[PDB]
Tab-separated table of C-alpha atoms and ligand atoms in Angstrom:
chain	number	residue	atom	x	y	z
E	253	UNK	CA	172.119	178.722	-33.548
E	254	UNK	CA	175.858	178.510	-34.207
E	255	UNK	CA	176.721	176.923	-30.866
E	256	UNK	CA	175.552	173.309	-31.353
E	257	UNK	CA	175.234	172.868	-27.592
E	258	UNK	CA	172.535	170.364	-26.620
E	259	UNK	CA	171.070	168.675	-23.566
E	260	UNK	CA	170.237	164.976	-23.391
E	261	UNK	CA	166.576	163.958	-23.452
E	262	UNK	CA	164.883	163.629	-20.045
E	263	UNK	CA	162.143	161.046	-19.591
E	264	UNK	CA	159.050	162.514	-17.940
E	265	UNK	CA	159.243	166.208	-18.784
E	266	UNK	CA	156.790	167.750	-21.216
E	267	UNK	CA	157.682	167.388	-24.927
E	268	UNK	CA	158.498	171.111	-25.223
E	269	UNK	CA	161.507	170.473	-22.950
E	270	UNK	CA	162.864	167.674	-25.153
E	271	UNK	CA	162.173	169.242	-28.557
E	272	UNK	CA	165.746	170.384	-29.108
E	273	UNK	CA	167.360	167.691	-26.943
E	274	UNK	CA	169.330	164.671	-28.160
E	275	UNK	CA	169.305	161.067	-27.065
E	276	UNK	CA	172.248	158.802	-27.837
E	277	UNK	CA	170.117	157.038	-30.466
E	278	UNK	CA	169.675	160.401	-32.202
E	279	UNK	CA	173.445	161.024	-32.249
E	280	UNK	CA	174.206	157.589	-33.715
E	281	UNK	CA	171.311	157.673	-36.212
E	282	UNK	CA	171.982	157.277	-39.956
E	283	UNK	CA	170.649	160.826	-40.358
E	284	UNK	CA	173.902	162.060	-38.758
E	285	UNK	CA	176.080	160.055	-41.166
E	286	UNK	CA	176.756	156.589	-42.569
E	287	UNK	CA	178.914	155.030	-39.867
E	288	UNK	CA	182.149	153.268	-40.810
E	289	UNK	CA	183.861	153.180	-37.400
E	290	UNK	CA	183.608	154.834	-34.006
E	291	UNK	CA	185.603	155.446	-30.844
E	292	UNK	CA	183.819	155.826	-27.488
E	293	UNK	CA	185.920	157.589	-24.838
E	294	UNK	CA	184.326	157.292	-21.415
E	295	UNK	CA	184.523	156.253	-17.775
E	296	UNK	CA	181.698	153.715	-17.283
E	297	UNK	CA	180.279	151.415	-19.983
E	298	UNK	CA	177.307	149.064	-20.278
E	299	UNK	CA	178.422	147.370	-23.485
E	300	UNK	CA	175.187	145.448	-24.112
E	301	UNK	CA	173.240	148.693	-23.770
E	302	UNK	CA	175.762	150.668	-25.827
E	303	UNK	CA	175.611	148.385	-28.869
E	304	UNK	CA	171.815	148.568	-28.790
E	305	UNK	CA	172.042	152.376	-29.139
E	306	UNK	CA	173.676	152.073	-32.565
E	307	UNK	CA	171.303	151.616	-35.532
E	308	UNK	CA	170.864	147.904	-36.297
E	309	UNK	CA	172.599	148.298	-39.663
E	310	UNK	CA	175.684	149.812	-37.943
E	311	UNK	CA	175.988	147.481	-34.937
E	312	UNK	CA	178.807	145.389	-36.431
E	313	UNK	CA	180.986	148.339	-37.491
E	314	UNK	CA	184.246	148.574	-35.494
E	315	UNK	CA	183.956	150.218	-32.069
E	316	UNK	CA	186.910	151.243	-29.892
E	317	UNK	CA	186.256	151.662	-26.155
E	318	UNK	CA	188.755	154.061	-24.533
E	319	UNK	CA	188.766	153.590	-20.754
E	320	UNK	CA	190.980	153.771	-17.686
E	321	UNK	CA	190.084	150.531	-15.885
E	322	UNK	CA	192.769	148.327	-14.305
E	323	UNK	CA	193.009	144.874	-12.698
E	324	UNK	CA	189.577	143.313	-11.983
E	325	UNK	CA	187.664	146.325	-13.323
E	326	UNK	CA	189.594	145.969	-16.582
E	327	UNK	CA	188.828	142.244	-16.701
E	328	UNK	CA	185.116	142.976	-16.179
E	329	UNK	CA	185.046	145.405	-19.107
E	330	UNK	CA	186.804	142.951	-21.416
E	331	UNK	CA	184.269	140.299	-20.393
E	332	UNK	CA	181.468	142.721	-21.313
E	333	UNK	CA	182.946	143.262	-24.769
E	334	UNK	CA	184.051	139.673	-25.510
E	335	UNK	CA	180.678	138.708	-27.124
E	336	UNK	CA	181.119	141.466	-29.780
E	337	UNK	CA	183.929	140.641	-32.208
E	338	UNK	CA	183.863	144.205	-33.594
E	339	UNK	CA	184.726	145.878	-30.256
E	340	UNK	CA	188.327	146.723	-29.357
E	341	UNK	CA	189.589	148.313	-26.157
E	342	UNK	CA	192.242	150.900	-25.320
E	343	UNK	CA	193.349	151.185	-21.688
E	344	UNK	CA	194.444	154.762	-21.090
E	345	UNK	CA	197.581	154.854	-18.951
E	346	UNK	CA	196.986	156.323	-15.487
E	347	UNK	CA	200.514	156.427	-14.087
E	348	UNK	CA	199.764	159.045	-11.403
E	349	UNK	CA	197.872	157.715	-8.394
E	350	UNK	CA	194.169	158.478	-7.893
E	351	UNK	CA	193.651	159.464	-11.541
E	352	UNK	CA	190.635	158.628	-13.669
E	353	UNK	CA	189.826	158.490	-17.374
E	354	UNK	CA	186.844	160.840	-17.209
E	355	UNK	CA	186.772	162.175	-20.803
E	356	UNK	CA	183.482	161.580	-22.633
E	357	UNK	CA	183.906	161.835	-26.387
E	358	UNK	CA	182.715	160.068	-29.517
E	359	UNK	CA	184.739	159.981	-32.712
E	360	UNK	CA	182.336	159.035	-35.502
E	361	UNK	CA	183.874	158.182	-38.884
E	362	UNK	CA	181.361	158.198	-41.729
E	363	UNK	CA	181.347	157.537	-45.441
E	364	UNK	CA	180.609	161.280	-45.733
E	365	UNK	CA	183.251	162.638	-43.339
E	366	UNK	CA	183.983	162.795	-39.612
E	367	UNK	CA	182.150	164.067	-36.521
E	368	UNK	CA	183.431	164.751	-33.001
E	369	UNK	CA	181.029	164.693	-30.030
E	370	UNK	CA	182.244	165.959	-26.676
E	371	UNK	CA	179.707	165.367	-23.938
E	372	UNK	CA	179.195	164.547	-20.252
E	373	UNK	CA	177.339	161.205	-20.079
E	374	UNK	CA	178.590	157.760	-19.174
E	375	UNK	CA	177.547	154.998	-21.577
E	376	UNK	CA	174.880	153.506	-19.309
E	377	UNK	CA	171.084	153.786	-19.408
E	378	UNK	CA	170.795	155.900	-16.249
E	379	UNK	CA	173.042	158.699	-17.500
E	380	UNK	CA	170.742	159.374	-20.471
E	381	UNK	CA	167.421	158.755	-18.704
E	382	UNK	CA	166.566	161.533	-16.229
E	383	UNK	CA	169.755	163.591	-15.777
E	384	UNK	CA	170.825	166.996	-17.051
E	385	UNK	CA	173.778	166.234	-19.374
E	386	UNK	CA	175.513	168.363	-22.017
E	387	UNK	CA	176.586	167.654	-25.607
E	388	UNK	CA	178.670	169.578	-28.121
E	389	UNK	CA	178.206	168.350	-31.713
E	390	UNK	CA	180.927	169.188	-34.219
E	391	UNK	CA	180.063	169.990	-37.833
E	392	UNK	CA	180.312	167.188	-40.355
E	393	UNK	CA	183.981	167.503	-41.271
E	394	UNK	CA	184.652	166.608	-44.930
E	395	UNK	CA	187.629	164.545	-46.021
E	396	UNK	CA	190.569	166.334	-47.616
E	397	UNK	CA	191.084	165.082	-51.160
E	398	UNK	CA	193.931	162.605	-51.583
E	399	UNK	CA	196.859	164.551	-53.010
E	400	UNK	CA	195.525	167.889	-51.730
E	401	UNK	CA	197.752	169.664	-49.196
E	402	UNK	CA	195.863	171.884	-46.779
E	403	UNK	CA	195.917	172.174	-43.027
E	404	UNK	CA	192.229	171.631	-42.385
E	405	UNK	CA	192.831	173.797	-39.308
E	406	UNK	CA	190.343	176.161	-37.644
E	407	UNK	CA	191.022	179.635	-36.203
E	408	UNK	CA	190.661	178.020	-32.755
E	409	UNK	CA	193.435	175.462	-33.554
E	410	UNK	CA	190.977	172.646	-32.739
E	411	UNK	CA	192.458	170.121	-35.169
E	412	UNK	CA	196.032	170.315	-33.861
E	413	UNK	CA	194.723	170.544	-30.291
E	414	UNK	CA	192.566	167.405	-30.592
E	415	UNK	CA	195.480	165.547	-32.169
E	416	UNK	CA	197.690	166.747	-29.293
E	417	UNK	CA	195.149	165.459	-26.747
E	418	UNK	CA	195.088	162.046	-28.453
E	419	UNK	CA	198.882	161.901	-28.797
E	420	UNK	CA	199.218	162.092	-25.005
E	421	UNK	CA	197.702	158.591	-24.683
E	422	UNK	CA	200.662	157.143	-26.626
E	423	UNK	CA	198.299	154.383	-27.830
E	424	UNK	CA	198.351	152.547	-31.198
E	425	UNK	CA	194.561	152.425	-31.574
E	426	UNK	CA	194.473	156.202	-31.112
E	427	UNK	CA	197.275	156.855	-33.594
E	428	UNK	CA	194.857	155.332	-36.119
E	429	UNK	CA	192.270	157.960	-35.145
E	430	UNK	CA	194.930	160.693	-35.290
E	431	UNK	CA	195.617	159.660	-38.881
E	432	UNK	CA	191.875	159.823	-39.612
E	433	UNK	CA	191.650	163.347	-38.173
E	434	UNK	CA	194.705	164.436	-40.215
E	435	UNK	CA	192.776	163.474	-43.352
E	436	UNK	CA	189.739	165.648	-42.549
E	437	UNK	CA	189.018	169.371	-42.752
E	438	UNK	CA	188.123	170.723	-39.293
E	439	UNK	CA	188.347	174.403	-40.275
E	440	UNK	CA	184.704	175.237	-39.470
E	441	UNK	CA	185.235	174.531	-35.751
E	442	UNK	CA	184.388	177.565	-33.610
E	443	UNK	CA	185.141	176.144	-30.130
E	444	UNK	CA	188.468	175.802	-28.300
E	445	UNK	CA	189.487	172.447	-26.862
E	446	UNK	CA	190.336	172.344	-23.145
E	447	UNK	CA	191.800	169.002	-22.140
E	448	UNK	CA	193.464	167.458	-19.128
E	449	UNK	CA	195.922	164.575	-19.359
E	450	UNK	CA	197.931	162.976	-16.536
E	451	UNK	CA	201.390	164.342	-16.000
E	452	UNK	CA	203.713	166.944	-14.539
E	453	UNK	CA	203.970	169.914	-16.895
E	454	UNK	CA	206.564	172.675	-16.751
E	455	UNK	CA	207.748	175.432	-19.041
E	456	UNK	CA	205.817	175.800	-22.276
E	457	UNK	CA	203.860	172.598	-21.612
E	458	UNK	CA	202.290	174.216	-18.531
E	459	UNK	CA	199.748	176.044	-20.696
E	460	UNK	CA	198.665	172.898	-22.587
E	461	UNK	CA	196.270	171.430	-20.027
E	462	UNK	CA	193.803	172.009	-17.201
E	463	UNK	CA	193.231	175.361	-15.626
E	464	UNK	CA	196.409	176.845	-17.137
E	465	UNK	CA	195.047	175.957	-20.583
E	466	UNK	CA	191.881	177.875	-19.717
E	467	UNK	CA	193.921	180.793	-18.392
E	468	UNK	CA	196.008	180.910	-21.581
E	469	UNK	CA	192.947	180.978	-23.840
E	470	UNK	CA	191.285	183.708	-21.773
E	471	UNK	CA	194.481	185.770	-21.824
E	472	UNK	CA	194.853	185.408	-25.608
E	473	UNK	CA	191.258	185.449	-26.853
E	474	UNK	CA	189.133	187.401	-24.366
E	475	UNK	CA	189.330	191.067	-23.403
E	476	UNK	CA	188.926	192.651	-19.999
E	477	UNK	CA	186.048	195.080	-19.538
E	478	UNK	CA	185.624	197.946	-17.063
E	479	UNK	CA	184.387	196.664	-13.719
E	480	UNK	CA	185.580	193.148	-14.625
E	481	UNK	CA	185.987	192.560	-10.879
E	482	UNK	CA	182.164	192.655	-10.708
E	483	UNK	CA	181.650	189.832	-13.254
E	484	UNK	CA	181.187	186.651	-11.199
E	485	UNK	CA	182.621	183.217	-11.913
E	486	UNK	CA	180.133	180.318	-11.934
E	487	UNK	CA	181.146	176.680	-11.620
E	488	UNK	CA	178.702	173.795	-11.759
E	489	UNK	CA	179.619	170.151	-11.234
E	490	UNK	CA	178.595	166.701	-10.023
E	491	UNK	CA	181.549	165.810	-7.777
E	492	UNK	CA	183.954	167.567	-5.406
E	493	UNK	CA	187.533	166.617	-4.564
E	494	UNK	CA	189.642	167.445	-1.532
E	495	UNK	CA	190.465	171.143	-1.997
E	496	UNK	CA	192.425	171.794	1.199
E	497	UNK	CA	191.854	173.227	4.643
E	498	UNK	CA	190.784	176.695	3.440
E	499	UNK	CA	189.988	178.582	0.259
E	500	UNK	CA	193.536	179.935	-0.105
E	501	UNK	CA	195.062	176.473	-0.666
E	502	UNK	CA	193.686	175.975	-4.194
E	503	UNK	CA	190.123	177.148	-4.842
E	504	UNK	CA	190.643	180.904	-4.642
E	505	UNK	CA	194.424	180.957	-5.205
E	506	UNK	CA	194.944	179.169	-8.490
E	507	UNK	CA	191.575	177.807	-9.698
E	508	UNK	CA	189.648	181.069	-9.288
E	509	UNK	CA	192.670	183.076	-10.451
E	510	UNK	CA	192.741	181.168	-13.735
E	511	UNK	CA	188.993	181.494	-14.179
E	512	UNK	CA	188.923	185.249	-13.649
E	513	UNK	CA	191.552	185.892	-16.357
E	514	UNK	CA	190.511	188.184	-19.195
E	515	UNK	CA	192.939	189.602	-21.712
E	516	UNK	CA	196.646	190.239	-21.732
E	517	UNK	CA	197.263	192.848	-19.021
E	518	UNK	CA	197.754	192.309	-15.290
E	519	UNK	CA	190.238	189.431	-5.646
E	520	UNK	CA	186.639	190.367	-4.852
E	521	UNK	CA	185.231	188.598	-7.920
E	522	UNK	CA	182.176	186.649	-6.663
E	523	UNK	CA	182.424	182.863	-6.978
E	524	UNK	CA	179.187	180.859	-7.302
E	525	UNK	CA	179.400	177.052	-7.075
E	526	UNK	CA	176.289	175.064	-8.086
E	527	UNK	CA	175.951	171.578	-6.613
E	528	UNK	CA	172.745	169.684	-5.678
E	529	UNK	CA	171.487	169.929	-2.104
E	530	UNK	CA	170.044	166.906	-0.317
E	531	UNK	CA	166.588	168.347	-0.971
E	532	UNK	CA	167.408	168.734	-4.687
E	533	UNK	CA	168.261	165.015	-4.829
E	534	UNK	CA	165.318	163.838	-2.693
E	535	UNK	CA	162.697	165.585	-4.822
E	536	UNK	CA	164.379	164.706	-8.140
E	537	UNK	CA	162.862	162.517	-10.847
E	538	UNK	CA	165.181	159.660	-9.809
E	539	UNK	CA	164.933	160.327	-6.093
E	540	UNK	CA	167.806	159.449	-3.810
E	541	UNK	CA	169.362	157.070	-6.420
E	542	UNK	CA	170.381	160.204	-8.345
E	543	UNK	CA	172.926	160.673	-5.554
E	544	UNK	CA	174.778	157.575	-6.712
E	545	UNK	CA	176.005	159.833	-9.537
E	546	UNK	CA	176.931	162.730	-7.204
E	547	UNK	CA	179.912	161.089	-5.463
E	548	UNK	CA	180.926	163.560	-2.748
E	549	UNK	CA	182.106	161.508	0.229
E	550	UNK	CA	181.695	162.434	3.887
E	551	UNK	CA	185.433	161.873	4.435
E	552	UNK	CA	186.223	164.609	1.912
E	553	UNK	CA	183.399	166.964	2.926
E	554	UNK	CA	184.116	167.013	6.663
E	555	UNK	CA	187.642	168.299	5.938
E	556	UNK	CA	186.362	171.393	4.093
E	557	UNK	CA	183.134	172.721	5.602
E	558	UNK	CA	184.380	176.196	4.591
E	559	UNK	CA	183.571	175.208	0.993
E	560	UNK	CA	179.831	174.773	1.456
E	561	UNK	CA	179.254	178.505	2.048
E	562	UNK	CA	179.943	178.825	-1.710
E	563	UNK	CA	177.249	176.327	-2.684
E	564	UNK	CA	174.062	177.170	-4.581
E	565	UNK	CA	171.070	174.942	-5.345
E	566	UNK	CA	170.468	173.261	-8.680
E	567	UNK	CA	167.650	175.085	-10.477
E	568	UNK	CA	166.829	174.761	-14.166
E	569	UNK	CA	163.322	176.096	-14.847
E	570	UNK	CA	164.718	177.624	-18.060
E	571	UNK	CA	165.096	174.089	-19.490
E	572	UNK	CA	162.406	172.338	-17.403
E	573	UNK	CA	165.149	170.360	-15.658
E	574	UNK	CA	165.084	171.429	-11.996
E	575	UNK	CA	164.227	167.808	-11.106
E	576	UNK	CA	166.749	166.254	-13.539
E	577	UNK	CA	169.897	166.078	-11.441
E	578	UNK	CA	173.021	167.468	-13.142
E	579	UNK	CA	175.812	165.276	-14.409
E	580	UNK	CA	176.832	168.018	-16.839
E	581	UNK	CA	179.725	170.215	-15.700
E	582	UNK	CA	179.877	173.848	-16.772
E	583	UNK	CA	181.889	176.973	-15.981
E	584	UNK	CA	181.129	180.496	-17.156
E	585	UNK	CA	181.688	184.225	-16.593
E	586	UNK	CA	178.410	186.186	-16.380
E	587	UNK	CA	177.999	189.944	-16.122
E	588	UNK	CA	177.031	191.420	-12.726
E	589	UNK	CA	173.321	191.230	-13.656
E	590	UNK	CA	173.691	187.797	-15.325
E	591	UNK	CA	172.316	189.119	-18.657
E	592	UNK	CA	175.517	188.417	-20.633
E	593	UNK	CA	178.434	185.997	-20.380
E	594	UNK	CA	182.060	186.522	-21.361
E	595	UNK	CA	182.518	182.766	-22.080
E	596	UNK	CA	181.046	179.335	-21.400
E	597	UNK	CA	182.741	175.947	-20.931
E	598	UNK	CA	181.108	172.510	-20.964
E	599	UNK	CA	183.442	169.781	-19.779
E	600	UNK	CA	183.926	166.496	-17.960
E	601	UNK	CA	185.987	168.279	-15.272
E	602	UNK	CA	184.502	168.357	-11.759
E	603	UNK	CA	185.606	170.674	-8.936
E	604	UNK	CA	188.832	168.838	-8.185
E	605	UNK	CA	192.604	169.218	-8.338
E	606	UNK	CA	192.869	165.838	-10.086
E	607	UNK	CA	190.811	167.195	-13.000
E	608	UNK	CA	192.065	170.791	-13.248
E	609	UNK	CA	195.641	170.437	-11.996
E	610	UNK	CA	197.492	171.732	-8.936
E	611	UNK	CA	200.740	173.661	-8.963
E	612	UNK	CA	203.842	171.946	-7.567
E	613	UNK	CA	207.560	172.665	-7.260
E	614	UNK	CA	207.302	176.284	-6.094
E	615	UNK	CA	204.643	177.102	-8.698
E	616	UNK	CA	206.706	175.876	-11.681
E	617	UNK	CA	204.926	172.593	-12.423
E	618	UNK	CA	201.244	171.766	-13.010
E	619	UNK	CA	200.378	168.227	-11.908
E	620	UNK	CA	197.226	166.593	-13.334
E	621	UNK	CA	196.021	163.120	-12.378
E	622	UNK	CA	193.172	162.523	-14.830
E	623	UNK	CA	191.945	162.697	-18.413
E	624	UNK	CA	189.299	165.393	-18.936
E	625	UNK	CA	187.873	167.125	-21.985
E	626	UNK	CA	185.627	170.093	-22.681
E	627	UNK	CA	184.971	172.841	-25.217
E	628	UNK	CA	185.146	176.595	-24.620
E	629	UNK	CA	182.773	179.072	-26.283
E	630	UNK	CA	184.444	182.486	-26.614
E	631	UNK	CA	182.604	185.504	-28.072
E	632	UNK	CA	185.628	186.419	-30.200
E	633	UNK	CA	185.320	183.059	-32.001
E	634	UNK	CA	181.860	184.192	-33.172
E	635	UNK	CA	182.684	187.817	-33.973
E	636	UNK	CA	181.171	189.055	-30.708
E	637	UNK	CA	182.238	190.906	-27.569
E	638	UNK	CA	179.911	188.925	-25.287
E	639	UNK	CA	177.055	186.408	-25.421
E	640	UNK	CA	173.536	187.361	-24.426
E	641	UNK	CA	172.018	184.765	-22.105
E	642	UNK	CA	169.067	182.939	-23.673
E	643	UNK	CA	165.936	183.539	-21.604
E	644	UNK	CA	164.309	180.131	-22.137
E	645	UNK	CA	166.674	177.343	-23.169
E	646	UNK	CA	164.346	175.832	-25.802
E	647	UNK	CA	162.619	179.064	-26.906
E	648	UNK	CA	163.299	181.260	-29.947
E	649	UNK	CA	168.258	186.246	-32.317
E	650	UNK	CA	170.460	183.143	-32.518
E	651	UNK	CA	173.513	184.976	-31.066
E	652	UNK	CA	172.268	184.258	-27.527
E	653	UNK	CA	173.874	181.461	-25.629
E	654	UNK	CA	171.684	178.617	-24.269
E	655	UNK	CA	172.622	178.514	-20.596
E	656	UNK	CA	170.837	175.357	-19.335
E	657	UNK	CA	170.127	176.416	-15.715
E	658	UNK	CA	168.693	179.447	-13.943
E	659	UNK	CA	170.517	182.696	-13.146
E	660	UNK	CA	171.252	184.126	-10.674
E	661	UNK	CA	172.078	180.929	-8.785
E	662	UNK	CA	170.278	180.579	-5.447
E	663	UNK	CA	172.319	180.184	-2.266
E	664	UNK	CA	171.608	177.159	-0.078
E	665	UNK	CA	169.201	177.924	2.730
E	666	UNK	CA	170.266	177.534	6.352
E	667	UNK	CA	168.665	174.075	6.492
E	668	UNK	CA	170.180	172.869	3.208
E	669	UNK	CA	173.208	170.569	3.061
E	670	UNK	CA	175.326	169.435	0.113
E	671	UNK	CA	174.495	165.998	-1.231
E	672	UNK	CA	176.949	163.584	0.400
E	673	UNK	CA	176.529	160.155	-1.088
E	674	UNK	CA	177.775	157.785	1.635
E	675	UNK	CA	175.714	158.850	4.659
E	676	UNK	CA	172.057	157.915	5.203
E	677	UNK	CA	169.022	160.158	4.749
E	678	UNK	CA	166.007	158.778	6.598
E	679	UNK	CA	164.060	161.900	7.634
E	680	UNK	CA	161.890	162.243	4.518
E	681	UNK	CA	161.229	159.883	1.589
E	682	UNK	CA	162.083	160.555	-2.041
E	683	UNK	CA	159.815	160.701	-5.101
E	684	UNK	CA	159.644	156.877	-5.229
E	685	UNK	CA	158.749	156.417	-1.544
E	686	UNK	CA	162.243	155.405	-0.416
E	687	UNK	CA	164.967	156.456	2.008
E	688	UNK	CA	168.736	156.373	1.344
E	689	UNK	CA	170.770	153.836	3.328
E	690	UNK	CA	174.327	153.383	1.887
U	732	GM7	N1	184.784	158.058	-10.554
U	732	GM7	C1	183.922	159.144	-10.991
U	732	GM7	C2	183.649	160.194	-10.134
U	732	GM7	C3	182.826	161.222	-10.563
U	732	GM7	C4	182.276	161.200	-11.835
U	732	GM7	C5	181.397	162.377	-12.256
U	732	GM7	O1	181.578	162.918	-13.379
U	732	GM7	O2	180.528	162.825	-11.468
U	732	GM7	C6	182.575	160.162	-12.700
U	732	GM7	C7	182.010	160.080	-14.115
U	732	GM7	O3	180.778	160.151	-14.311
U	732	GM7	O4	182.795	159.910	-15.076
U	732	GM7	C8	183.393	159.129	-12.270
């Protein structure tokens, strides 16, 4: 496979469903490279646990934690890291209210080169235990010889784009990592970076981030096909923001409009949203506690009941993960019979304006509250017109893309409800014998 898209290991499924999966200990193993330094971008950290995931011989190498915590949360994280003299911290500025540092990324500097890992898991035991999470593994990027002048750039512009994402933090510890990236050859990269950073973007900068970044890449690097209006959009996520009083406010007016872009020229496109039902969570490996990582509040949900008619159950027989609740986020463009896809995105971004951006100032400014990061797989970047959908995620041409859940998505039944994490469920017990009482 050329895609280097992986799922995390899930405890309790049969070995055939973990054979091609990766645990964090696999990613950090010496087999992946001889570690010199690393940066861990994330939201939530268990520092004691995190250091134990590095190989013993690498546990004193410098580690930078990139986070968004403030005030007492920030103090708690520093207290976690204080016992480890090799750990430094970078507080990402969040100068727009209600923003989050969501991005999940590892920068791994080795004696042999550099690796970038863009993934969906928090750095805590539970996120790697029994959840469906996604990982993109970069190639081992070699160092450019001292005195040699080459760009090290890929046809997808990944090197400049990753540097641009890091520059937006305006942080000295990340300028060090920018200088590291400058010194390496990233030309083999076949994915496009799609990032979000906090700000208000107008003019040229509008296309740099969020859903306008996606739109720009689809305009420039995908082509429209006949009957494109019949190719659905699929979005799949672990959290939902306030989207407005009806679908015209944001979901179908700018979000869907960006996602249905194909090619340069100028809607009844079906929109499928995949988000665990209450029954999905109850019967999951974790049981109701899985819902602690699906943070859709009743205050948000009761303002947008129109949204739930778009919702489809989580189902992942293809990867043996129907009972491993999703914390991965993915977006893609399948054909009308779901046998091909025009593109696939794995990202930190949930279904929210904070993550993707919302237009302001009479449509001239894109406002983003949060840091997000994902990678886009486009057929053109692999010399293809479309991707065939892989029939079984872990089965055996290699030009078929490993979609990790079942197609077509299945609409909620009349008795199903979206998982809402801060109301009780006491009708039926979960797989551990328990109810849910927030
Ligand atoms: N405050 C958060 C809300 C939602 C999520 C999610 O991704 O589901 C996260 C996260 O895991 O980073 C953090």
